[PDB]
Amino acid sequence: MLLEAIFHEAKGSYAYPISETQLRVRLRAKKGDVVRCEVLYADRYASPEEELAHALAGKAGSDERFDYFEALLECSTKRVKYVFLLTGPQGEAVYFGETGFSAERSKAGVFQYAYIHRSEVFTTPEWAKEAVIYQIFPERFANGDPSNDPPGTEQWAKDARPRHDSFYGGDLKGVIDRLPYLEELGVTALYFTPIFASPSHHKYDTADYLAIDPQFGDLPTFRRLVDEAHRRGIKIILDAVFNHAGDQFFAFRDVLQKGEQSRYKDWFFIEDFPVSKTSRTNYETFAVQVPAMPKLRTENPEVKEYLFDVARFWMEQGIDGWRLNVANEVDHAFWREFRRLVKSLNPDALIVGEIWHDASGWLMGDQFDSVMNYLFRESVIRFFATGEIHAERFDAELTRARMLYPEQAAQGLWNLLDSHDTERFLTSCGGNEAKFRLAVLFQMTYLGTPLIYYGDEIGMAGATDPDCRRPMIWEEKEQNRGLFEFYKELIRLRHRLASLTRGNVRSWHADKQANLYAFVRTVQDQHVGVVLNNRGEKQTVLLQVPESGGKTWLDCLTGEEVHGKQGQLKLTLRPYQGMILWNGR
Ligand SMILES: OC[C@H]1O[C@H](O[C@H]2[C@H](O)[C@@H](O)[C@@H](O[C@H]3[C@H](O)[C@@H](O)[C@@H](O[C@H]4[C@H](O)[C@@H](O)[C@@H](O)O[C@@H]4CO)O[C@@H]3CO)O[C@@H]2CO)[C@H](O)[C@@H](O)[C@@H]1O
Numbered sequence: 396m397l398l399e400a401i402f403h404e405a406k407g408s409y410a411y412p413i414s415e416t417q418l419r420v421r422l423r424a425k426k427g428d429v430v431r432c433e434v435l436y437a438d439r440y441a442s443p444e445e446e447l448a449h450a451l452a453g454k455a456g457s458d459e460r461f462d463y464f465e466a467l468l469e470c471s472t473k474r475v476k477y478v479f480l481l482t483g484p485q486g487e488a489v490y491f492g493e494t495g496f497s498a499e500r501s502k503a504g505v506f507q508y509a510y511i512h513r514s515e516v517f518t519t520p521e522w523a524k525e526a527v528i529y530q531i532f533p534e535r536f537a538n539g540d541p542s543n544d545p546p547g548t549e550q551w552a553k554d555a556r557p558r559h560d561s562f563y564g565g566d567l568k569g570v571i572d573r574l575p576y577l578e579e580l581g582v583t584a585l586y587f588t589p590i591f592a593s594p595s596h597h598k599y600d601t602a603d604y605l606a607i608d609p610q611f612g613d614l615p616t617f618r619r620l621v622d623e624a625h626r627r628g629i630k631i632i633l634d635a636v637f638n639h640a641g642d643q644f645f646a647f648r649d650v651l652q653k654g655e656q657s658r659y660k661d662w663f664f665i666e667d668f669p670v671s672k673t674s675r676t677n678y679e680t681f682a683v684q685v686p687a688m689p690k691l692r693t694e695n696p697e698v699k700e701y702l703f704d705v706a707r708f709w710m711e712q713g714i715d716g717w718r719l720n721v722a723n724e725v726d727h728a729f730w731r732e733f734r735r736l737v738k739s740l741n742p743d744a745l746i747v748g749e750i751w752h753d754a755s756g757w758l759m760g761d762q763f764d765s766v767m768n769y770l771f772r773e774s775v776i777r778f779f780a781t782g783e784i785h786a787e788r789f790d791a792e793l794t795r796a797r798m799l800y801p802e803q804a805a806q807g808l809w810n811l812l813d814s815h816d817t818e819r820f821l822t823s824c825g826g827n828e829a830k831f832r833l834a835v836l837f838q839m840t841y842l843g844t845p846l847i848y849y850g851d852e853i854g855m856a857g858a859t860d861p862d863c864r865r866p867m868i869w870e871e872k873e874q875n876r877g878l879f880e881f882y883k884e885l886i887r888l889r890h891r892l893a894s895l896t897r898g899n900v901r902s903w904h905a906d907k908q909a910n911l912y913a914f915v916r917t918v919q920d921q922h923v924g925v926v927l928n929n930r931g932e933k934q935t936v937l938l939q940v941p942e943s944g945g946k947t948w949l950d951c952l953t954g955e956e957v958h959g960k961q962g963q964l965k966l967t968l969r970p971y972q973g974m975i976l977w978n979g980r
Contacts (some may be wrong), residue, residue, distance in 0.1 A: 398456075398486065401424050401491060402422065402424075403423065403506065405507055407801075408756070408799060408800055410508050410617070411759075411802075412515065416511065417467055417468065417469055418468040418508055419465065420477070421463055422452065422464045424464070424481070426457055426458075426897070427484070428463045429481045432480070433449060433450065433466075434449070434466045434481060434482060435447040436477035437475070437477075437746065438475065439472070439507060448469070450464075450467065452466030452805040455899075456900075456901065458790075458792075460900065461795075470508075470511060475507070475508050476499040477507075477704055478491065479491035479503075493505060493860050515618045515772055517767070519804075520716075520743040520744070522745075522766065523716075527839075528582065528585070528586050529585050529586070529849070532815050532849060533565055533569075533587060533590050533598075533611050534563060534598070535557075535865065535870070536570060536828075537570060538551060539568035540566050540568035540569070542593070543609070543610045543611065544610065548564040553868055555866055556865070560596065564610070567590070567620050571620050571624075571708070578628065580879070580883060582847070582883055583630060584629060584630030584716075585630065585632065586634075588815060589633075590607060590634070593608055596861075599634075599636055599720065600639070600688045601636055602644075603645070604701075617789055618712055622713070628716035630716065630745075632717060632745060634652075634717075634718050634719055637691060637722075637729070638724045638726055639681045639688040639721070647659070650663065650670060652666070654668050655689045659698070662695060662698045662740045664677055664679035665678040665679075672908050678690075693725040696937065699874045707736075710740050710744065715743070716746065717745070717746060718748075718749060719749055720748075721749060722750060723750045724765075727762060730763070731761050733746075734761065745764060747764065747809060748765050750769065751769040758800040759801065760803065764804070765804055772810075772811055773794055775837070779830050782910075782929075786910045789904045793841075805842055806845065807844050808843040811848060812838055813848045814863075815848075815863055816859065818858050818859040819850070819856050819858075819865060821851070829970070830929075833973050835885065836927075837927055838883075843899040844875065852878065852882045853869070855868055859979065872933055888975065892916075892921070893918045894922070894923045898917045899917055902915075903938060904926075904936070904938045906936065909929065910929045911936055913925060920978075921977075922980070923951075923977050923980045926968065926972065926975075927968070928971065931971065933959070935966060935968065936966050937964065937966070938964045939962070939963055940959050940963055942962060945959070946960075947979060948964075948978055949976065949977045949979060949980075
């Protein structure tokens with residue numbers, strides 16, 4: 396076996412507690428190199444004579460070139476040292492420890508997970524495991540209060556193609572009036588884009604962190620919204636913009652007027668005085684040159700004290716969590732203290748970070764509960780939309796990521812198909828709804844928290860920003876209700892099938908020629924297998940189905956068809972059809 400591909404480290408996503416007494420442990424190896432992987436472990440202070448415990452780690456998945464093995468060590472001492480025993484195809488075995496590789500269990504060395512602190516067991520709010528979030532862009536969602544409307548608001552119609560500087564008058568009142576809608580679709584929580592006072596369309600450049608923007612509403616209406624959504628079983632997640640403030644943020648105004656005599660000069664990153672927001676800048680902003688968003692010095696104890704208060708205030712109104720704008724650009728220090736705070740006020744308040752890339756460092760348990768899954772989005776784009784990759788690559792990309800973070804995180808990752816910063820998935824698919832549905836069908840059944848982008852459920856389309864911020868189509872006759880009901884059913888299934896929300900994922904079948912991929916979600920003895928035939932022609936397939944998880948399954952989308960004979964299941968699939976098999980337990 397190629398030792399150069401064997402991997403594990405006693406921390407991160409390869410060693411982590413799922414409770415105060417059990418250690419989840421993972422190991423990597425060249426695919427097909429190791430057939431059996433066992434872990435020999437014992438207390439860190441246990442005697443050399445004492446016998447070791449045994450833990451058999453089956454394959455939890457496999458990627459483009461590696462096999463991932465996963466074990467669960469019962470560490471009653473809450474301390475543990477351990478070694479790996481690896482065996483190959485033709486029977487060769489070898490030991491793996493911190494010291495290195497060896498045929499002797501001694502020279503292999505032993506890995507060490509010092510202690511397991513209860514305070515360090517990664518915990519996600521129970522409700523987040525089985526929620527289905529619906530992202531709302533207020534300014535472009537619903538106009539329920541016309542006098543809210545800001546100047547230059549444009550006609551609200553289907554054939555409306557937004558402008559970077561466009562306004563449509565949608566406000567919080569609009570969201571309250573549409574709650575009836577959301578309950579029907581079945582959303583569990585709403586994620587609102589920034590809604591505090593801001594002169595912009597997106598409101599990402601905050602004027603007042605403590606004020607609903609007038610065109611969006613007022614404190615009363617907000618309390619009103621929270622209350623009304625809650626009694627409807629819908630949670631509240633607001634956009635927390637702590638990386639940067641608006642050029643109108645009171646303290647920046649101070650800097651813009653009193654120069655160095657301002658007590659707030661130290662709340663931003665400024666090169667040369669006086670401040671010049673002309674076309675260039677003498678202060679650090681969001682992207683490159685973006686004047687309305689001077690970066691905020693979150694490292695400043697004072698700036699931090701302020702933003703937490705901003706958080707306290709709004710949290711006093713009953714909201715349920717935060718999506719953190721450009722979170723990866725604010726110090727972990729701030730965020731670690733942040734989790735400390737938020738959780739202190741509400742254990743179930745949800746913490747969501749916005750990192751469009753490997754956020755493994757924030758998903759260790761001390762900072763975030765999840766992040767919007769950048770990759771899920773990409774893997775789904777390449778497989779369903781563009782076709783840049785085949786079924787087997789899908790499984791690879793799909794699996795490789797899962798092994799990226801600790802189970803607690805992956806369980807809640809916000810798997811979106813799109814957001815306000817990208818093209819809409821329908822057009823992402825070249826308008827092919829067929830392909831589209833398969834992706835939402837999958838999105839709605841895979842490991843993580845589904846995030847519907849407002850309007851997607853009605854067949855709304857649009858290019859990337861700002862075309863993806865089109866006013867929600869509210870006229871039923873121009874709505875894709877055919878698709879709307881599709882969502883209700885998939886959404887419902889998620890709430891009815893425990894495995895789909897609290898289960899693990901193991902790949903079931905992957906055929907590159909068929910470009911057909913399937914997986915199985917499991918919780919206890921309940922097994923739900925999802926079959927995805929990504930081809931414009933229908934082909935039948937035979938999946939390996941060992942007669943122990945069942946020989947009878949029901950297509951929760953249509954109806955029964957248990958063809959398990961002599962260990963396998965022959966399935967004929969319609970084009971771009973997906974099947975969801977419930978093992979009946
Ligand atoms: O004029 C500036 C813009 O300000 C507002 O933009 C928001 C976005 O709507 C938010 O979603 C968010 O997005 C950032 C993101 O945080 C940041 O990492 C960056 O992302 C990269 C990413 O590293 C990478 O995956 C790659 O694919 O490209 C991305 C660039 O698109 O950029 C995102 C968006 O620029 O925060 C910003 C800033 O608050 C406003 O809504 C926009 O309309 C406006 O143009």
